Symmetry: C3
Subunit: 314 residues, 3 copies
């Protein structure tokens, strides 16, 4: 199977500058070379060039709506094209707002896809329920069908078409959810596994459930949108919004090892890695390495080890 890496150096989804550098650090860490060592054909598409929308006035509270809307429109086009060609897309991004376009494009070719969102946050705030007009916290709100029309139209997002419903998304790693978002997830009946459920059940059972919930009836393409802040700050410190009590390194790789085994991974996003937020060079290296580790795990690398087929090492 073919893999296509698409760089999304975008940062207008949030305050902190630096996330746009995420793609370069991931590559510098050898992400592409390491991927080629797996059983997949790896093509690197390179980073997308985002045209800055001049005079991008804030829509009420939402900031840089046009720059964010246009950047995502371009990514969706690119992701649609590669999905079309039967490849698995891998979006290396800046902030999580780029999930709008990643999933949108993906849904265009695979409308029956389901989403597994690993994040300490629900990123389901609407333009009206946001304490900060930061779009990297409102991705899911633009994608959900049940949220269509529950908020004014935002400049730059008219091209967006609600592609997934509340029954096609599973959250894993919740621990910092705003009141509005919590009202929305409870009201819409969305399935989630906050840290309390991870502690209660154990990551093993959590994965078991998330899958029977999403794949039981029909087997369908899986889109994994991974917010690096889903892990505890001790593992992925160089991120804009760290939250203590996160998932551990082990649990993160478990998640990715299990998603790899289903053979259904069709889309992937590795977001919020901000190379400039590392208090020490080591904190950035730690974060980058872990993100690379998770990506490789999604594509075969097993902690129990790997060996090439048809090769007699004896």
């Amino acid at each position: 199977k073919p893999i296509e890496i698409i760089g999304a150096p975008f940062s207008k989804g949030q305050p902190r500058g630096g996330v746009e550098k995420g793609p370069a650090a991931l590559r510098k860490a050898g992400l592409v070379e390491k991927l080629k060592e797996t059983e997949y054909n790896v093509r690197d598409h390179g980073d997308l060039a985002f045209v800055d929308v001049p005079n991008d006035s804030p829509f009420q509270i939402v900031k840089n709506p046009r720059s964010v809307g246009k950047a995502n429109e371009q990514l969706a086009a690119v992701v649609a094209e590669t999905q079309k060609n039967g490849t698995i897309s891998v979006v290396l991004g800046g902030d999580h707002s780029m999930a709008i376009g990643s999933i949108s494009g993906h849904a265009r070719v695979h409308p029956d896809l389901c989403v597994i969102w690993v994040d300490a946050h629900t990123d389901i705030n609407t333009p009206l329920t946001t304490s900060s007009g930061n779009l990297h916290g409102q991705p899911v709100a633009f994608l959900l069908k049940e949220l269509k029309g529950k908020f004014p139209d935002v400049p730059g997002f008219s091209w967006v078409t609600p592609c997934i419903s509340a029954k096609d998304i599973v959250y894993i790693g919740l621990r910092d959810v705003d009141p509005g978002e919590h009202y929305i997830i409870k009201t819409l009946g969305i399935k989630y596994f906050s840290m309390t459920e991870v502690d209660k059940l154990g990551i093993g059972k959590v994965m078991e459930e998330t899958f029977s919930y999403l794949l039981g009836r029909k087997k369908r393409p899986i889109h994994l949108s991974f917010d690096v802040d889903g892990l505890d700050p001790v593992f992925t410190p160089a991120t804009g919004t760290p939250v203590v009590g996160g998932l551990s390194y082990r649990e993160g790789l478990y998640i990715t090892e299990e998603i790899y085994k289903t053979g259904l991974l069709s889309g992937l996003d590795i977001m919020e890695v901000n190379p400039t937020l590392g208090k020490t060079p080591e904190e950035v290296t730690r974060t980058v390495n872990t993100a690379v580790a998770l990506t490789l795990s999604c594509f075969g690398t097993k902690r129990e080890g790997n060996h090439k087929p048809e090769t007699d090492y004896l």
Copy 2:
């Protein structure tokens, strides 16, 4: 429901100076303001003034028996008064010796209450079985009925009346128990979940069992005495007696999240936070924030989020 915060700046329960500053730090961290943001009515009773007993000679090996006996007798009076008024008491303390009065006062109004003791220690040493006359390590010994008369009367504690039996107390987090204490818990048949049981079962099953054990037959008021050293030193470093291999921040909140859900929390003690034992300002901030976190969790804050009733955020 009403909540009453009662500060117990006492430190004669142990050798290390500083725990008496515990209450001030917890408040400085915004404990009271944050509590008010919950669905409970919050009233701060302020800190109690403890009259120092002059010429407090040590009873054999027990140190400051009179200062400790009188400080507790006073707290018990205060806690009994607030419980009487139908409020949930919250004791912010110095050392754990103050549990004698917290639980005693509580038991006066709710004689059928059960106790969940989160501690790396059993604190069940008797005046005769202590290697150190430190009273912060003998609280349970004064409260247990089965231990009544198994040790000489100590100056300043004649007012104490054994209010709970070995079947009404559950320990969680044990890992540093003295021989005498271990002889006592095994002999008395006390129920406990040391770290080995937490590892074996997982915190989820642990909570499940501690409730069927204490609540299976009758539903009764729950008293949670929380020794901060129950969590691992990596989480609550600023404490007088840290023990490696402790409960994690996640497990701590789980315990508190589950105790909140029962709707039975009737009394609470957040002890051993010693603001002066932090090797770095960060180590004290860490400890204080975690203690505050656990308290807020005991009263509703869920990691999955919370939203106000009757409010349509859309």
Copy 3:
């Protein structure tokens, strides 16, 4: 039961200098005195003096084959002697290559012994499958019967006799296994619990299984070869080959507490503690203290506590 501590200050099993100092640090930490406080008879045999083989040319890729072959031949003799006298041997080592002699000696007196290998690595590379001639990574390859003759004879190891088969060894903590090793463990059908299995099952079930697997049919002597790098670098940082995502302190002690309970522990190795690899004095203290902790756990110390028999502490 008697315990015999045998120091193996050897370091030619790998490139990093310092592991030979492991035994001295372990003793300095009070390992011997603390052991004496247990219910076992403790005898310190002292450290062995290893005669350096001059002009020890590398066998193809394998380095210091003769120095390593002779050092182990001597240890095996010593371990055989003590096992003979009905004592439990405890090898405080440098690098893990010394497991060749520890287990070999042990097997001579107890041929039906089984092995539980806690390591982040499989240390089952053969002289032909190593990327470095480092012998600390090839111990199991010299001990396995199914690997006999699958590699050339190495200078200094002719005395070695394959004493255990693929069905008598269980690995716990795997996460860094080379392709050749992974081919070998899969091909030979060896039983293992890599970190993914630990995350999936939980350490509790893992131990349960390792025992029914190795002890289900017959009860036999247990040999525990503990590579300190089996625990996460956060716990045992002072080691030559640290690997993130390891077993936790808690899980380490669980393993040792469970092995103690079987009453079958017959041989033990506490390897790879390198006092010179600690970035800070604290990192070395941490590592040394944990290694001592695990050892004491193997011999009785329970986290729930301990009390001497026939003694009425009341």
